[PDB]
Amino acid sequence: SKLKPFFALVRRTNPSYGKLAFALALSVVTTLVSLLIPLLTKQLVDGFSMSNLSGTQIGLIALVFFVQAGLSAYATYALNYNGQKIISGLRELLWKKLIKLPVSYFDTNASGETVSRVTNDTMVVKELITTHISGFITGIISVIGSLTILFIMNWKLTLLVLVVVPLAALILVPIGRKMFSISRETQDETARFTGLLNQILPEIRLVKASNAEDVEYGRGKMGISSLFKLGVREAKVQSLVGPLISLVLMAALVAVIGYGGMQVSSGELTAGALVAFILYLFQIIMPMGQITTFFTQLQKSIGATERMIEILAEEEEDTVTGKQIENAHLPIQLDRVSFGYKPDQLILKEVSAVIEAGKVTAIVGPSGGGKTTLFKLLERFYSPTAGTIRLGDEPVDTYSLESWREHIGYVSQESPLMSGTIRENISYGLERDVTDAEIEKAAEMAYALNFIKELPNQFDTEVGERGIMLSGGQRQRIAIARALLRNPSILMLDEATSSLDSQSEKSVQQALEVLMEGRTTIVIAHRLSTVVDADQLLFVEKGEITGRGTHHELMASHGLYRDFAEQQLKMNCDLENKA
Amino acid sequence: SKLKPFFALVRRTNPSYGKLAFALALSVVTTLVSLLIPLLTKQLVDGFSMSNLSGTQIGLIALVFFVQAGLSAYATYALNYNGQKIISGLRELLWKKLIKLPVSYFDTNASGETVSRVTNDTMVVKELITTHISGFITGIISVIGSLTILFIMNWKLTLLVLVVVPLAALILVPIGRKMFSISRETQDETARFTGLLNQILPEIRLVKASNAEDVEYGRGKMGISSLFKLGVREAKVQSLVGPLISLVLMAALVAVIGYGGMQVSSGELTAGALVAFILYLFQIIMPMGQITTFFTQLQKSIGATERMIEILAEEEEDTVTGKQIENAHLPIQLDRVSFGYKPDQLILKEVSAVIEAGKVTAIVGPSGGGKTTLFKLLERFYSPTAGTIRLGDEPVDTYSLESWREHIGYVSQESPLMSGTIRENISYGLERDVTDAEIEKAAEMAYALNFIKELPNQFDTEVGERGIMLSGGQRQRIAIARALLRNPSILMLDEATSSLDSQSEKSVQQALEVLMEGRTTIVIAHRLSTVVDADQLLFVEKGEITGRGTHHELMASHGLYRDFAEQQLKMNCDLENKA
């Protein structure tokens, strides 16, 4: 039942079944060859009466050892090499999917969790394929094979092992479960106490000022004391568990080996048959260890194969069907548009606007008021809940998302840069050709060239986490040059959120104007004073919009709706409004 | 050499040496009793000729097993119980030290690192005391004892083990070191690749907008490929290492047990002497495992005992010698005061001021300009580099730090609250008696009572990390009530840094005035407009101070020094200065 999705998943990578089957066959043959070794030692030891020592018998044991090792090396390489092919194919599929999942997917799901899945689930599956299946089969063949060979030479001494091994395990298991429960509880109390100490130490500033020396000592002392009480409770458990595990193991060993010796010493058995018996006991206990591990692995494996298949079945973004845009700067109408993540809550509704060729329109309104939805609707970062976005007089969902994203340009504050060269960032993702003589003809414009020429290298710095740190103004100027190299007909601007420094800001404002000249521009911001020059402002009413005039008209005949943001500004200052 | 600081450290806890010595003696006796068991099994097995089976011989083995387990339970409890006493004593010493280390210590050293030390070093030392020393001694006695008993019954078969065991180890060790090196390199490349994927995923916003789909796919594909290449290099190592470990172990076992059988089968040995030989081999291999672990533990232990002793030898704050203050609101002079963390850089120098009875003085100046040093000097959070702080006409270092911290009061923005009750916070650390009828007579003042009475409980909420989250204004009002319950003669105020919300701020300003009335107040802040009412402002010049007048005098005859902060404000707004 559960093995049909795993198999299907493995088949997605078009694996070579012959090579895996042959490797498994070699493992099975390696285990069967490992059951000859104790019979050949018994034949050698039984044949040592009057000390003949036939050299062919000790040489044949070496030939069988080198043959077992040669086949085990081949099977182990083949299994690992194909597992490495299978896992590589899985990761390539998962990565090609992730890069095409709609930007909605990363809005709902954590990027780190997705990375964690593609890096761990594939690993689990690998581990299952390369080691655990072959380990499990070989262990079963080794265990049942060894017991069958033992019962055919001396059934009394294996009947004893088939009582001693289960009765020893029936004791050690519960005693071990009980032990581990106490280890977890002391770990948790250790954690609680470290947490408590951590929490007191950064507030030492007040503790000192308030004369709370004995008070904070005493609350820490109660933690020392609760840890000590659990430590004594662990001591009273570990003192019974330790001696009892050693008592059981040695009583099992003495019982098995002493009855082996008491058969050889009476004549009911030979010296070489006892030798074979010990040599097989090691071939019972260890693979029995192996097989047990298979099942936990199998559970984890199922969960992984559930998550990966989940990703690789999800919807991907249809970026490449529709028309091609001609004369793209034409009027963007919204007419009866609407949105919500689910129809339970319509985040934006009954909206209409026009956005005008070569002008600016500014989305500015209350913090947390949903205003970011209209911006994400206009850049196609989100599909409307059945209401029209229209360019000129054609519904915008007509044009291909490639032919849309090509005639849009995009810039933000708070941006990092792509790990790569500075010329690679100044021309990122655009498949048109570029040249040294024009890539800096886009960079002199944002004042990027005459900044970049002062760095240790004029085309690289390993920008981002590897290279030197850059200030927000430098990062913005690098973004503004990329958009001048695309020469988009429409521009989407994310001017600021959170908080920022005003250092060099007037030179950054003079850098920004370059890009927005003579093309249609849509801006989103957190304050009115940054937006005083705009040809239409849009105020946001937690689901609906008004304003639809100059900044001054908001200051003249809007009133209370300016006051619902301007009061929070006037708690700090008049923000250069001077009114 | 290295054992003299550990021992001294252990002696600091006044441990019971008799009980540890007796537990170690019991462990040694338990190991010697564990060397009888295989001789008694040999006597039983050798005595089984003609199958007499004397019941006293199989009963005596059980009596020796229950005696070994009884003494092992007692020794194991005693060792763990005394280790739990020793570690508890260590932690109590370390915590009583930390709480008294000067506030300078936590300024240089990370609190988390100190917690980590007191929670891990003590543990390491515990582990060494309870398990590793006894484990090491018992292993040596078990190993040398078992080998000495083997050589006295059959020296040929132990001479073989004393060649087989070292020659097997001389192979497995290097092959294992080499194996682990490849496992580390693949871990690192896995980490590098996850890091790379992580770094791409939160920037999916641009990747989509820029048409960088094949570009970001290909950079990820190169990571899949480098991981696959290292995976194949690991496969070519694991394929030789696995077979070779199994080949060696089985060749060692076959050689030892086959020569055991070939002695019994020729008559050079008995069936029971072979049984004893196997039973002792297990008493050689496992404690040899144990002893090896002792040394790594010993190294770690030394490092721990080095850090803990370091803490427990450090200087602690002399909080309780000097005079007692009378009439504490008198003039605080600074005259030729100076400071620095080291004399290499004098952070503040040649400073003089007066701070005046029942007035306000405000420390306001450039960000990162060192101004926080003068505030920390005035509250005695730091000693001057030989220049006088003086109250009335007495040097302030005359009064006890208790009798100082009692006549000071202290409040800050950005503060958390002590984990505890709300009545416990409103009266924190003060050793004077309090009553329900007066603790709320301090709380009605900050408007704290009529806020607290609306919570689910009127005296508790488990405030901080356990309970409900509180806003900055509520936390400030709780702090302001504590200072009214102390009724300090002098007040130290940290008004704001970083960033804050203006929500309810005018009601918080009306709450703050309550505390500062009719007592001397020192304030530190980040903007001039918050401080317009102050009777003296102090501007800071990266080592020296001026201003020494009203806010308006800074606005009238200071000029360029107001401009060196006011310009950065005027990039945003005039900040209600209206000039």
Author numbering:
A (entry chain A), B (entry chain B): 10 to 588
Please quote the paper that reports this structure:
pmcATP-binding cassette (ABC) transporters are ubiquitous membrane proteins that couple the energy of ATP binding and hydrolysis to the translocation of a wide variety of molecules across biological membranes. Here, we investigated whether a large separation of the nucleotide-binding domains is required for the transport cycle of BmrA, a homodimeric multidrug ABC transporter from Bacillus subtilis. Upon ATP binding, the NBDs engage in a transient tight dimer where the two nucleotides are sandwiched between the Walker A motif from one NBD and the ABC signature motif from the other NBD, thereby generating the OF conformation that is prone to drug release. Overall, our data suggest that the NBDs of BmrA function with a tweezers-like mechanism distinct from the related lipid A exporter MsbA.
We then introduced the A582C mutation into a cysteine-less mutant of BmrA replacing the single native cysteine at position 436 by a serine. For this purpose, we introduced by site-directed mutagenesis a cysteine residue near the C-terminal end of the NBD to restrain the separation between the two NBDs during the catalytic cycle and analyzed the impact of the disulfide-bond formation on the ATPase and transport activities of BmrA. We determined by cryo-EM the structure of the oxidized A582C mutant at 3.14 Å resolution. Consistent with its ability to transport drugs, the mutant displays a canonical IF conformation similar to that seen in related multidrug ABC transporters from the type IV subfamily. Interestingly a clear density bridging the two monomers is visible at the lower part of the two NBDs. This allows us to build the disulfide bond between the two Cys582 residues. As both were solved at identical resolution, it is presumably the cross-link bridge between the two monomers that rigidifies the C-terminal region of the mutant transporter. This allows us to build an additional ten residues in the oxidized C436S/A582C mutant structure. The transmembrane helices are perfectly superposed (rmsd of 0.45 Å over 549 residues) while the NBDs are slightly less separated in the mutant structure. We found that the presence of the disulfide bond between the NBDs did not prevent the ATPase activity nor the transport of drugs, demonstrating that a large separation of the NBDs is not mandatory for the transport function.
